[PDB]
Design a protein around this nucleic acid. Sequence first.
RNA 1: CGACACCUGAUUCC
DNA 2: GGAATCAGGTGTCG
Lengths: 154, 151
Amino acid sequence: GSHMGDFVVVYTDGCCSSNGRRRPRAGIGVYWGPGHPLNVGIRLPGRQTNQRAEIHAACKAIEQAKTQNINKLVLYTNSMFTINGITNWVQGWKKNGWKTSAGKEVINKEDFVALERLTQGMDIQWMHVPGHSGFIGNEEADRLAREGAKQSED
Amino acid sequence: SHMGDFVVVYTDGCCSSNGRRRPRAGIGVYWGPGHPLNVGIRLPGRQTNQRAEIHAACKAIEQAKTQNINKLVLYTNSMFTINGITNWVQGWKKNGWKTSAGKEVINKEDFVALERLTQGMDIQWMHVPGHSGFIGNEEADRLAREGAKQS
RNA sequence: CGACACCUGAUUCC
DNA sequence: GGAATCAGGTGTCG
Ligand SMILES: [Ca+2]
Ligand SMILES: [Ca+2]
Ligand SMILES: [Ca+2]
Ligand SMILES: [Cl-]
């Protein structure tokens, strides 16, 4: 199980097939290690978009971890939108009604709020991993996030 | 009706055993039975599918040059090379070669060199659906493999 | 404008 | 069931 000095490692990823198209199918994915018992591939409730799938993949992780009574983790992801939110954009947003830099409702509020609710007491070390750059951890989490939005066909 | 004016040529580029044990790509260009210019050498460089399939078009016309031929019909199954040369290049030339997604068009170095030889020359690209018609393809296609074997 | 993603479609190969 | 690669489009924020 990947660790990094008392910081248990974890990769997360979200996906949303047909994002911005008629019927969006979106799922969350979180990989803790090979054949690891915490590796989830859930489907994302409600709104179907990559952005929330992505930040919610991260929620699942934290949510999971707490249950495993782990307080500090190095959570990798390829979502800058999530990282930038959770560690910058949010703070501001709170002090001003969650209004975008163009003066309008911070769209993914509900999502970030949840996510921030969970950073509480946790010492997350948000790390970013490149796209299809070949990093296992991320590709296995990607793998998972799809099986989470599986078609149900077969 | 009308006369006749060009020469035909089939071209194929292949990339092997995906994994690591390998990734051998070969070029292969056919001009007809036993014809001298028929050749199927190995692809020099970053061994890949697309890339080979392109340079495999360079050699073609490049030899077309070494024959003072001014216009041919080039056959190929990859409409990446085709689309690339018949369209996406002018665009790439008017955008510092940026993928219609912000990043850099990887085979610029290739599509560049290719557009070079296209100079003065008049190529009429012909795409052929896999398992197309005309043995011509199965033949170039065959040298490719033979090429990929050389060191 | 920029940035990180999420896709849809194509063509070939095996 | 990918790897090659591209076009076109959304998700969202500075
Ligand atoms: Ca992602
Ligand atoms: Ca992904
Ligand atoms: Ca071929
Ligand atoms: Cl013929």
